[PDB]
Amino acid sequence: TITPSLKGFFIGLLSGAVVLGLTFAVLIAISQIDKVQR
Amino acid sequence: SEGGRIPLWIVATVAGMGVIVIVGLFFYGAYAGLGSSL
Amino acid sequence: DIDGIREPVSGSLLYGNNIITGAVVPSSNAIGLHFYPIWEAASLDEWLYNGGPYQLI
Amino acid sequence: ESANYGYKFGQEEETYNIVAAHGYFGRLIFQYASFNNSRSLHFFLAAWPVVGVWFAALGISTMAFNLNGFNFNHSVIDAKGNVINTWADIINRANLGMEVMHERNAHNFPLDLA
Amino acid sequence: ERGWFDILDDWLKRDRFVFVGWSGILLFPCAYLALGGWLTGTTFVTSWYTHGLASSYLEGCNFLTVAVSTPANSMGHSLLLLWGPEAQGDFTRWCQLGGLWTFIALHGAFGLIGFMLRQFEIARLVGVRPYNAIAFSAPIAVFVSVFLIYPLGQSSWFFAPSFGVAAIFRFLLFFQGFHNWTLNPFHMMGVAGVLGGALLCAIHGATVENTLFQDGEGASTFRAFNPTQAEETYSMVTANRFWSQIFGIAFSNKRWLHFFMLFVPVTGLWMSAIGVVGLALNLRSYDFISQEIRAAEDPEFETFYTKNLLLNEGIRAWMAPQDQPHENFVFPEEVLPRGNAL
Amino acid sequence: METITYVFIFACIIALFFFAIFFREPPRIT
Amino acid sequence: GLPWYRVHTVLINDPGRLIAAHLMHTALVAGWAGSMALYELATFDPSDPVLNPMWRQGMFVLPFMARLGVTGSWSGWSITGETGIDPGFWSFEGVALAHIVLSGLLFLAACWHWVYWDLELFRDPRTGEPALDLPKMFGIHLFLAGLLCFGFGAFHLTGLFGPGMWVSDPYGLTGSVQPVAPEWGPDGFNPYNPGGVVAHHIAAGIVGIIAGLFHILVRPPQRLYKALRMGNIETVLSSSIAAVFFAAFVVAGTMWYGSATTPIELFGPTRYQWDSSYFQQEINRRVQASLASGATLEEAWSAIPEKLAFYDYIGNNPAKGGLFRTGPMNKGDGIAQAWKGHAVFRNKEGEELFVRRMPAFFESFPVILTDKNGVVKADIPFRRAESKYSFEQQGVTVSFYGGELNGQTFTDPPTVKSYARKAIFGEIFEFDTETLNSDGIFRTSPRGWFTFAHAVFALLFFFGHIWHGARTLFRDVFSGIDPELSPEQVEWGFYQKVGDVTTR
Amino acid sequence: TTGERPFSDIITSVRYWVIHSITIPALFIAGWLFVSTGLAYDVFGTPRPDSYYAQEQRSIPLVTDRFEAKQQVETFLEQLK
Amino acid sequence: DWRVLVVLLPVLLAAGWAVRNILPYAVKQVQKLL
Amino acid sequence: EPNPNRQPVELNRTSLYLGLLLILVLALLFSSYFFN
Amino acid sequence: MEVNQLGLIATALFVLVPSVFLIILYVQTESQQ
Amino acid sequence: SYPIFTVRWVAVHTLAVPTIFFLGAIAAMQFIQR
Amino acid sequence: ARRTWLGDILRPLNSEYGKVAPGWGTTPLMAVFMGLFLVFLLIILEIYNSTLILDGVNVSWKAL
Numbered sequence A: 001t002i003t004p005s006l007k008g009f010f011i012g013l014l015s016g017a018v019v020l021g022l023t024f025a026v027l028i029a030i031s032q033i034d035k036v037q038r
Numbered sequence B: 001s002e003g004g005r006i007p008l009w010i011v012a013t014v015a016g017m018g019v020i021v022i023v024g025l026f027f028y029g030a031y032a033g034l035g036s037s038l
Numbered sequence C: 001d002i003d004g005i006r007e008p009v010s011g012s013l014l015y016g017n018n019i020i021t022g023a024v025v026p027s028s029n030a031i032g033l034h035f036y037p038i039w040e041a042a043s044l045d046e047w048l049y050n051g052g053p054y055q056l057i
Numbered sequence D: 001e002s003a004n005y006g007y008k009f010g011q012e013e014e015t016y017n018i019v020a021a022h023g024y025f026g027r028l029i030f031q032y033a034s035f036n037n038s039r040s041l042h043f044f045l046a047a048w049p050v051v052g053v054w055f056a057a058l059g060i061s062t063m064a065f066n067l068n069g070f071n072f073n074h075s076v077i078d079a080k081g082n083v084i085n086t087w088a089d090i091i092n093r094a095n096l097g098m099e100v101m102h103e104r105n106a107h108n109f110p111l112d113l114a
Numbered sequence E: 001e002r003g004w005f006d007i008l009d010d011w012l013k014r015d016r017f018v019f020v021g022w023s024g025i026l027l028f029p030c031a032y033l034a035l036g037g038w039l040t041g042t043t044f045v046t047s048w049y050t051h052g053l054a055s056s057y058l059e060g061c062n063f064l065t066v067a068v069s070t071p072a073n074s075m076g077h078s079l080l081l082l083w084g085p086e087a088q089g090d091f092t093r094w095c096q097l098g099g100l101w102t103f104i105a106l107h108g109a110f111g112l113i114g115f116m117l118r119q120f121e122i123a124r125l126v127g128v129r130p131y132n133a134i135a136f137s138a139p140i141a142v143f144v145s146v147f148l149i150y151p152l153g154q155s156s157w158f159f160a161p162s163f164g165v166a167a168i169f170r171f172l173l174f175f176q177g178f179h180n181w182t183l184n185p186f187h188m189m190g191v192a193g194v195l196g197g198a199l200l201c202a203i204h205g206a207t208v209e210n211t212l213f214q215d216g217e218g219a220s221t222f223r224a225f226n227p228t229q230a231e232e233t234y235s236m237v238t239a240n241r242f243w244s245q246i247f248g249i250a251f252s253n254k255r256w257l258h259f260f261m262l263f264v265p266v267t268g269l270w271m272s273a274i275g276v277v278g279l280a281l282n283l284r285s286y287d288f289i290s291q292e293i294r295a296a297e298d299p300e301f302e303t304f305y306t307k308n309l310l311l312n313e314g315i316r317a318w319m320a321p322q323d324q325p326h327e328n329f330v331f332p333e334e335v336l337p338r339g340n341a342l
Numbered sequence F: 001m002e003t004i005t006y007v008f009i010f011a012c013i014i015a016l017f018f019f020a021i022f023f024r025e026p027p028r029i030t
Numbered sequence G: 001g002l003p004w005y006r007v008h009t010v011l012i013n014d015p016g017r018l019i020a021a022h023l024m025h026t027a028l029v030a031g032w033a034g035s036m037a038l039y040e041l042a043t044f045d046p047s048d049p050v051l052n053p054m055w056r057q058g059m060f061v062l063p064f065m066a067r068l069g070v071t072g073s074w075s076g077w078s079i080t081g082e083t084g085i086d087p088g089f090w091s092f093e094g095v096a097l098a099h100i101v102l103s104g105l106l107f108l109a110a111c112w113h114w115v116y117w118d119l120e121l122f123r124d125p126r127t128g129e130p131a132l133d134l135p136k137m138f139g140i141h142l143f144l145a146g147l148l149c150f151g152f153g154a155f156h157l158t159g160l161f162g163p164g165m166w167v168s169d170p171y172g173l174t175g176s177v178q179p180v181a182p183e184w185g186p187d188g189f190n191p192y193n194p195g196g197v198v199a200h201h202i203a204a205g206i207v208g209i210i211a212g213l214f215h216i217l218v219r220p221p222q223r224l225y226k227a228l229r230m231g232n233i234e235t236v237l238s239s240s241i242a243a244v245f246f247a248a249f250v251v252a253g254t255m256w257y258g259s260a261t262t263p264i265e266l267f268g269p270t271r272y273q274w275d276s277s278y279f280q281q282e283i284n285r286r287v288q289a290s291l292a293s294g295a296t297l298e299e300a301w302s303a304i305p306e307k308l309a310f311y312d313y314i315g316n317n318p319a320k321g322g323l324f325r326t327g328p329m330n331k332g333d334g335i336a337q338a339w340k341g342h343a344v345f346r347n348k349e350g351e352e353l354f355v356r357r358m359p360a361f362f363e364s365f366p367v368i369l370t371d372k373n374g375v376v377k378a379d380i381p382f383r384r385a386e387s388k389y390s391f392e393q394q395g396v397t398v399s400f401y402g403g404e405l406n407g408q409t410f411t412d413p414p415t416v417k418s419y420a421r422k423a424i425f426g427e428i429f430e431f432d433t434e435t436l437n438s439d440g441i442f443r444t445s446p447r448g449w450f451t452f453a454h455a456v457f458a459l460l461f462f463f464g465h466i467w468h469g470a471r472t473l474f475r476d477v478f479s480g481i482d483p484e485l486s487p488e489q490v491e492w493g494f495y496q497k498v499g500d501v502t503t504r
Numbered sequence H: 001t002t003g004e005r006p007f008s009d010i011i012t013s014v015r016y017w018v019i020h021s022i023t024i025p026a027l028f029i030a031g032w033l034f035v036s037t038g039l040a041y042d043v044f045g046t047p048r049p050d051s052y053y054a055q056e057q058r059s060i061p062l063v064t065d066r067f068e069a070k071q072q073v074e075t076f077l078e079q080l081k
Numbered sequence I: 001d002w003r004v005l006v007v008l009l010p011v012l013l014a015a016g017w018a019v020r021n022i023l024p025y026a027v028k029q030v031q032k033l034l
Numbered sequence J: 001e002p003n004p005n006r007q008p009v010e011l012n013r014t015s016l017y018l019g020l021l022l023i024l025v026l027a028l029l030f031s032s033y034f035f036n
Numbered sequence K: 001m002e003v004n005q006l007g008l009i010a011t012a013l014f015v016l017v018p019s020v021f022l023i024i025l026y027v028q029t030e031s032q033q
Numbered sequence L: 001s002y003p004i005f006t007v008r009w010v011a012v013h014t015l016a017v018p019t020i021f022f023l024g025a026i027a028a029m030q031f032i033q034r
Numbered sequence M: 001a002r003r004t005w006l007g008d009i010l011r012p013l014n015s016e017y018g019k020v021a022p023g024w025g026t027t028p029l030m031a032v033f034m035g036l037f038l039v040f041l042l043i044i045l046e047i048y049n050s051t052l053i054l055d056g057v058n059v060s061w062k063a064l
């Protein structure tokens, strides 16, 4: 069954994905705007 | 404004004196209130 | 007899010590800060009992 | 071959590139946290351990006159007056165990004054 | 190909005031959280429910006595995730139960990984050999052995070191009383590496500073150096003669000298880490059996080795009830080991 | 035997010092 | 010339002599396993699997033979106590003989591959230079590992064609080798479910077969090939060392905490079973069950198996040893002969008192006796002059139930104090200290030694991964940095992107 | 130099001080009030000086179970009357 | 909880003041990089 | 069949003195524990 | 003293085997040109 | 001629902002009485 | 170099040194599998650790 701690594991997993997701989303956007001149 | 108006030696003196005030307050606290043994 | 209480401590290899436990043992508490050269002892055997070598070293 | 054969005793030219090392170490932290002057870098290497060991020697030398470490035994007290232990009090428990056991036959009176 | 990956690679490796890199994605959040968590906990968080100790500025402790303390022994080796089954997502309970200790220890571990990846990353971009990253393996080995392996060998995180000045002092003293850690030859090698490393640091810096060439006219000799100059700034030949005549031997190879300076402290820290791995299992160098057999049978036999065990026995009996509260040790006065009078 | 072993090892090290000092590789300037 | 720490680099571009060195290493390791088993067999005492099991005797490889189904000697004995068994060829001796013969065969193969190093197979067909296609070698070797993994779980562990593995009850009383069915549900990931071990090898093996076919048929992407230097064999060394210390840490932990693959009848109890009084609780439950069913106190304790009681003794706790206390545990407290029985202490008022047990942390520990509420009622004083809890003052007696002292009661203080000093160690045993000249000082078990060695090695191999990974990624500057390194690339502001000359 | 305005430039400009003569005192005062209102105690679960012990009790409220540790602490907190 | 707005009001009154003095310069910095 | 990968090995005198010193000191350190 | 008797040969081989290794390497370096 | 909001700006303020807040909290603690 | 019967049979298995797939190839598929494997290790670690507790999974010797 879905124990309270299995629920906690899912909440932990989705939290990390969100944190990593927003981090790379911000980084990719910023890198697309402030490009190096070659 | 004009990035260089206030002389740096004044800046350093005022910042220095503020450090002294805040660290003195901490040593005062060692002799009064919590953690004073009294 | 480091602490001056007639309780001698063994420091040397021949008297049961290894490299880790061995020592030259400090001079006796009965001597305090008195100067204890060989010639202030009545014998070498006295000097050794009282930790004379520590001072010399 | 060992890279040590790339230096010859007494050669006039330096054997490494201090601009490269500064360029690396400057980026590891930030540029102004790194030495570019070999003379002041090596002075720092001398001064830090020497000054520190001077203070250690002065510690033993001043505790020789029984000016001891900070004592915070029972410094924290609650509203009623109960002792609230800190890590300093745990250190004190260990010190007591050393105190009462050391030179177990040498003291006749309750205080170890030297 | 100039896809999003290469564009991002460009931005991460810009030459800015603080270099970032790919390694910075791991390094900066984990280093920042580890530090912030230590500052947060030493300022605001108690150790009452895990240790019976006050441990924060808010409670009246000072810089020497604040700590972030280990969790209670009943937590075992629990990761103590905030959303885990112990705290159940409650931030306040999580603090009271010791959650900040795993938080700091784990983010710290990954921060150190991030720092070493940064040394590799910057070295590859600048074009230097990665010996600085290799030397940093020793602090990582110490952190990992002392803060992770050691408690994992023991009953719980409780017995890991707590993150505080006086808390660490208690750890040193615990290791003398229970492990006889001064007797351990792996610690002895670590001491030699640390003290010999300090020795090398002082003596190399003093030698360079006192064999300088006069490359300028000022009494302050620092000004007479240019980073791009080709010549050595001090005389290896004179340095070599002085030390040969003072001490018998001297360095003659400057590359060997500086490798040796890498080698000595690094190797010593690695040796001490191996000893602590042993102590994780109570695999101590506690006794010399031959000394004990003689001393048991001969009450006149006494060495500094037997003297120190009496000290360890005092430490154990006098600190254990307070230091291990979950054990509920009640030692009546009459059982406490004590010498005469004291 | 332990005592003999300890003193033997110590004596070798002292002999090592002698050779390391007086029969070292001579440093040569080039 | 080559410095001494580099002599083995002559094999980097010589695949035939690399195989010879690998063959010779494999012969040495196989030889060690054969000679270790022979030495163990010449010293092992099979006569008492109850109080003198293999883990009391310093046996290291014997448990690993027993774990996978080798339990008997050609001489007719078995580790579970049976006599008159015929183990077939695959006795402990037959296993050791096969490793010795394998070692000699591999030695001869090594000589052949050393001499005939210049085989056309090791040359690139286009360029004629020595060359190994490591991407495809991985797939081949991964495919073989998959097959072996799968066949081990599917046939050997299941008993479909093979012996199975060592399984036991939760208290390590009735261990034996048994066929094990795989567990396919979530409990298969329980480290204490042996069916999980069977399912892992069936399912990881199949994945390895699939993955192996993939790395055989699909070339590496250019971007990974460049990034990882897949033309450089030292990149395989670096990643292989990384996998190897990962695995060493895992086997060290599962040996310390216990699992289905580290049974206590082969390696001894864990430290945590003493921390939590795991065995003492089962002992007391069985004694309570007996008393509940009308048995007397002497019948309740006489029914406890000696083997169960022996686990409830700190001398079998692996956390009680010392780094330089060498040899079998029998060299310390002696060879266990009999359970003396359960000591029960009482005071002059007839209250039962309980000795406080020694925690594993403590080399020595005071003798303290409490009532059932934890109130101190007697002890052995240090300072006598203000003692109030002395055995003499409190009238402490000891009575034994079960074991060789069953039914006896002692009342003289010095004998009662002697038994109470033993009681801090848990259940009390009679030991033969003479046969081995035991010194009375505790030693750790094979569980301790295994854990120590593999944790230390795992940590050292971490340094190996760092070193060889550094050498792989920085090969171009191994002998120094470029003499013509311009200041512009290392000073700030010249290039927009660090290291990139196209951003000036 | 890597493009950013020099620090000596910034901290000697009137505008820097116009902004930071507000923002620095304001953060300081926010930290003060976090303690002075008692909020810091309740965020972090730190005892006040009158909350380490019940009036007569001398035992530590030590957590002794792993999965009921949260209830143990809440129970210990009720027992303060 | 009144204490949360008493502790955050000095923080948010500081972040508001630094915007009135930096907005004519920040608009100029973001438009320049676009 | 002359294998072309062979290289001479060296150990200079200074390295001999350093190696002997390490070995002898390590033995002086560990011998007490070997005897126990 | 009741020391472990294996300590003697353990210490002796600990010194001798690695010292011999270095002596072999050094002497064949000298004998080279 | 110079940008205001950079990575160095962010790094400086993630450390400096909480440091001033914590200093105010610790200053307040010096007047707490048991 | 020396040909042998067994060498001739194994020749095709050591003939593609240096052969690569253009660009990124299957790297994204590899990333997905690595991410799955991380979640897998995380699960078995947390089960062993008693941070993840499942019905009918009793991490104890009492599971025989």
Ligand code: CLA
Pocket: A010, A011, A012, A013, A014, A015, A016, A017, A019, E025, E026, E029, E030, E033, E079, E080, E081, E082, E083, E099, E102, E103, E104, E106, E107, E110, M035, M038
């Ligand atoms: C950026 C680097 C970084 C890293 C490496 C870590 C690492 C860690 N954090 Mg930290 N943390 C970070 C940044 C980071 N943190 C930041 C920016 C914050 C502020 C928000 C925090 C705030 C924080 C808190 C409050 C806590 C941690 C904790 C932890 C530890 C456990 C985390 C965990 O289990 O996640 C597991 C999650 C993942 C591994 C995500 C991986 C995603 C996979 C690869 C893809 C699949 C996801 C999929 C798309 C979603 C499916 C959902 C579905 C199943 C329902 C671990 C050491 C915990 C701790 O320290 O306990 C003591 C803890 O309580 N962190």
Ligand code: CLA
Pocket: E144, E148, E149, G183, G184, G188, G189, G190, G191, G196, G197, G199, G200, G201, G203, G204, G205, G207, G208, G245, G246, G249, G250, G254, G259, M041, M044, M045, M046, M048
């Ligand atoms: C489908 C059914 C199935 C079942 C029932 C199992 C069952 C099992 N698997 Mg298997 N597995 C399967 C399929 C299956 N597997 C498949 C298809 C694959 C892909 C090939 C795997 C790949 C795999 C791996 C890689 C591992 C397992 C393991 C296991 C065992 C886990 C219990 C345990 O003891 O963990 C104990 C191990 C862990 C909980 C993992 C810990 C990892 C550590 C924490 C990472 C940290 C490393 C770091 C460097 C350490 C230093 C830190 C320290 C210094 C502080 C269990 C027998 C584990 C095992 O064999 O354990 C003995 C294991 O490591 N499986």
Ligand code: CLA
Pocket: E267, G040, G043, G057, G058, G059, G060, G323, G324, G325, G326, G327, G328, G445, G446, G449, G450, G451, G453, J026
């Ligand atoms: C995985 C490795 C391993 C493990 C865990 C064991 C475990 C065991 N062995 Mg076995 N053994 C092994 C490999 C191993 N062995 C090998 C490779 C051999 C062939 C030599 C043997 C031959 C052997 C014999 C002949 C015997 C054993 C016995 C035993 C048992 C007692 C162990 C003991 O007292 O050690 C004591 C451990 C130490 C004293 C630790 C040594 C620490 C070293 C010296 C540190 C060196 C540090 C180094 C100098 C640092 C350099 C620093 C520099 C780089 C700066 C124990 C079950 C005994 C037994 O009871 O059999 C029934 C027994 O008689 N073993």
Ligand code: CLA
Pocket: G004, G005, G006, G007, G008, G009, G237, G241, G460, G461, G462, G463, G464, G465, G467, G468, G471
């Ligand atoms: C799979 C394991 C493995 C393999 C195949 C290699 C292979 C290599 N190593 Mg690497 N290395 C490893 C693991 C490995 N290493 C580990 C775990 C570490 C950390 C300890 C290192 C740290 C390391 C360094 C610092 C260096 C190498 C170097 C080398 C190269 C030259 C080696 C040599 O000539 O030594 C010659 C060695 C001797 C002549 C005597 C060594 C005696 C040892 C120290 C004690 C004896 C131990 C005993 C005999 C065996 C115990 C087995 C053990 C696993 C239980 C060679 C490619 C060198 C290199 O890169 O050259 C360019 C180099 O400088 N390695």
Ligand SMILES: C=Cc1c(C)c2cc3nc(c4c5[nH]c(cc6nc(cc1[nH]2)C(C)=C6CC)c(C)c5C(=O)[C@@H]4C(=O)OC)[C@@H](CCC(=O)OC/C=C(\C)CCC[C@H](C)CCC[C@H](C)CCCC(C)C)[C@@H]3C
Pocket: D028, E030, E031, E034, E035, E038, E104, E108, E109, E110, E111, E112, E115, E132, E135, E136, E138, E139, E143, E162, E163, E164, E165, E168, E194, E265, E266, E269
């Ligand atoms: C206690 C002694 C000690 C400290 C405090 C220390 C500190 C440091 N060492 C560094 C470097 C090094 N140390 C090295 C060799 C050594 N370092 C040694 C011992 C120390 N080294 C020794 C003995 C050696 C000889 C082998 C080398 C070769 C380097 C470097 O190259 C590197 C450097 O740059 O030097 C200038 C820096 C790494 C910065 C970093 O990781 O940021 C990131 C921050 C992170 C990842 C946070 C980690 C969090 C930590 C691990 C846990 C939390 C700690 C709390 C916040 C504070 C607790 C404090 C209480 C205990 C009182 C840092 C200044």
Ligand SMILES: CCCCCCCCCCCCCCCC(=O)OC[C@H](COP(=O)(O)OC[C@@H](O)CO)OC(=O)CCCCCCCCCCCCCCC
Pocket: D043, D046, D047, D050, D051, E205, E206, E209, E210, E219, E220, E221, E222
């Ligand atoms: C001025 C007070 C100095 C007190 C401490 C002494 C510092 C220097 C001694 C180190 C000797 C190491 C071996 C010699 C190494 C050696 O040869 O040094 C040489 C080095 C350079 O020599 P120069 O000839 O160029 O200059 C020295 C004189 O000739 C003056 O020109 O000397 C200095 O730089 C002296 C600096 C004095 C100014 C120091 C100011 C004090 C700062 C203290 C801050 C920390 C306080 C304690 C906090 C915990």
Ligand SMILES: CC1=C(/C=C/C(C)=C/C=C/C(C)=C/C=C/C=C(C)/C=C/C=C(C)/C=C/C2=C(C)CCCC2(C)C)C(C)(C)CCC1
Pocket: B019, B023, E032, E033, E035, E036, E037, E038, E039, E040, L014, L015, L018, L019, L022, L023
């Ligand atoms: C934990 C946690 C977290 C985090 C947090 C953070 C990140 C924080 C930070 C914080 C901080 C960041 C803080 C800081 C502080 C600081 C301070 C408090 C300082 C002080 C200082 C001083 C006091 C000084 C002194 C001195 C010195 C040192 C030397 C010189 C002289 C003088 C005296 C000046 C989160 C939320 C994520 C989640 C939950 C948990």
Ligand SMILES: CC1=C(/C=C/C(C)=C/C=C/C(C)=C/C=C/C=C(C)/C=C/C=C(C)/C=C/C2=C(C)CCCC2(C)C)C(C)(C)CCC1
Pocket: G028, G029, G030, G031, G032, G035, G100, G101, G102, G103, G104, G105, G107
């Ligand atoms: C030829 C031939 C043969 C024979 C063979 C043989 C007879 C073999 C043997 C083999 C062997 C018999 C081997 C052995 C080996 C061993 C080894 C290889 C060992 C090693 C060791 C080690 C490595 C150790 C180390 C250590 C020490 C010493 C101390 C402590 C620490 C350690 C652990 C590290 C036959 C008829 C079959 C057939 C074919 C032909």
Ligand SMILES: CCCCCCCS[C@@H]1O[C@H](CO)[C@@H](O)[C@H](O)[C@H]1O
Pocket: G334, G415, G418, G419, G422, G429, G430, G431, G432, G433
């Ligand atoms: C000898 C005093 C009379 C009381 C019995 C003492 C506790 S029991 C005694 O203890 C010895 C040490 O473990 C063992 O060697 C021996 O087998 C055992 O009989």
Ligand code: OEX
Pocket: C003, C029, D102, D103, D106, D112, D113, D114
């Ligand atoms: O002599 Mn050596 O130790 Ca200086 O305290 Mn008093 O005295 Mn004795 O007691 Mn503690």
Ligand SMILES: [Ca+2]
Pocket: D079, L033, L034
């Ligand atoms: Ca009051």
Ligand SMILES: [Cl-]
Pocket: D101, D102, D103, D104, E307
């Ligand atoms: Cl003393």
Ligand SMILES: [Cl-]
Pocket: D106, D107, D108, D109
């Ligand atoms: Cl006195």
Ligand SMILES: [Fe+2]
Pocket: D042, E204, E208, E258
């Ligand atoms: Fe230098």
Ligand SMILES: [Mg+2]
Pocket: B029, B030, B031, B032, B033, B034, B035, B036, E060, L029, L030
């Ligand atoms: Mg105060």
